[PDB]
Design a protein around this motif. Sequence first.
Motif, short mmCIF file in Angstrom:
data_model
loop_
_atom_site.label_atom_id
_atom_site.label_comp_id
_atom_site.label_asym_id
_atom_site.label_seq_id
_atom_site.Cartn_x
_atom_site.Cartn_y
_atom_site.Cartn_z
N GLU A 219 0.84 -1.20 0.00
CA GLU A 219 0.00 0.00 0.00
C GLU A 219 0.88 1.26 0.00
O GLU A 219 1.97 1.30 0.59
CB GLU A 219 -0.96 -0.01 1.21
CG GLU A 219 -0.29 0.19 2.56
CD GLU A 219 -1.30 0.47 3.66
OE1 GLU A 219 -2.46 0.04 3.54
OE2 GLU A 219 -0.97 1.14 4.67
N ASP A 264 9.07 -6.49 -0.20
CA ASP A 264 7.87 -6.50 0.65
C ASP A 264 7.52 -7.90 1.17
O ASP A 264 6.89 -8.03 2.23
CB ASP A 264 6.70 -5.88 -0.09
CG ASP A 264 6.88 -4.40 -0.34
OD1 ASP A 264 7.94 -3.78 0.01
OD2 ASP A 264 5.95 -3.74 -0.87
N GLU A 268 10.29 -7.84 4.39
CA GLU A 268 9.33 -7.39 5.41
C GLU A 268 8.51 -8.53 6.03
O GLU A 268 8.28 -8.54 7.24
CB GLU A 268 8.41 -6.33 4.80
CG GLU A 268 9.12 -5.01 4.62
CD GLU A 268 8.17 -3.88 4.18
OE1 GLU A 268 7.10 -4.25 3.60
OE2 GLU A 268 8.50 -2.70 4.41
CA LIG Z 1 5.82 -0.30 1.87
#
Ligand SMILES: [Ca+2]
Length: 308
Positions: A219, A264, A268
């Motif tokens: 996002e 991502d 992450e």
């Molecule tokens: Ca991000």
Amino acid sequence: KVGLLVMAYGTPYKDEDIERYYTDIRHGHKPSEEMIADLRGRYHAIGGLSPLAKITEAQAYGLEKALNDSQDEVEFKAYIGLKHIEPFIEDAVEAMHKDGIEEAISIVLAPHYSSFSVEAYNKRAKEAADKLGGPRINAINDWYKQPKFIQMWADRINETAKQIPADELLDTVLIVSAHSLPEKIKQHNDPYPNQLQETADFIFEKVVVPHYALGWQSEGKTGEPWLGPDVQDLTRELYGREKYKHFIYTPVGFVAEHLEVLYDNDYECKVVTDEVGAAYHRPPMPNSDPEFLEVLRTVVWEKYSNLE
Ligand SMILES: [Ca+2]
Ligand SMILES: CC1=C(CCC(=O)O)c2cc3nc(cc4[nH]c(cc5[nH]c(cc1n2)c(C)c5CCC(=O)O)c(CCC(=O)O)c4C)C(CCC(=O)O)=C3C
């Protein structure tokens, strides 16, 4: 010949391209030094630049070859058109027109439709062709229902799952995801969220993994709500409720390794699995695997056969 307009997001070719690329993403509004530094830092974290340009080429020209090697009713010629760096969508349509292409089929290297993604690719391609007088562009809007697409992902998931101890498979969850979009698309029944849910459901019923969830990733930096849950947040929530030992991430909205998978997911999401003490799995992306080129060949050939 029939033009084959193959479209994708684009990626910087050189470190120095990051500024102009990010500006194009932001509709011409230059990002701040801090925003640029954040993005450059993510590209640096995955090795400097993304492999997406080379993969996109291999997909487009591999598709061209799979089509031309399989039939002799027509000759396809691929033209790559990118959303946010040259060769732009508009450059690809100009090239077809200059080469005398009268009819084209277009495909986006993203299997799901949305008003922010495929709709915008198609509008730009059509508007460029209209101004030039041709070619006529026959657009494919989505292709996630293709059975070979679902089976490709199921096969990759089952290959990963077969290496998980059998006594831990009951503690394994499949996280199916795609690029998030503003939540407001739901207000007008945009098909994108339901297409992702259908994709997750179709894959789930073909894999040995007993648990699954749908999430979203990547996002943007805005002041409005985006589709969730975010995959990082969902990982935390599911570990909280169910104590899963293995998380398998399939960001099936994407078709290649690029920044939004390599950072991502592989940075992450692994940060979260590491924090809770679970194992991180992320099967290979389709890239230019022969199986995936066969998915795309099936899609385009069915489209061509239906136009005729
Ligand atoms: Ca991000
Ligand atoms: C739906 C969708 C897809 C999937 C469909 C498709 O494939 O088209 C996609 C793919 C990709 N998105 C990519 C990269 C980026 N997208 C950004 C920003 C944004 N994407 C958006 C949407 C999408 N994007 C939106 C609505 C924004 C916010 C814009 C704003 O802020 O107004 C930003 C800016 C920084 C950030 O937001 O992190 C970057 C760097 C790369 C290339 C990665 C590489 O270089 O390897 C790929 C394949």
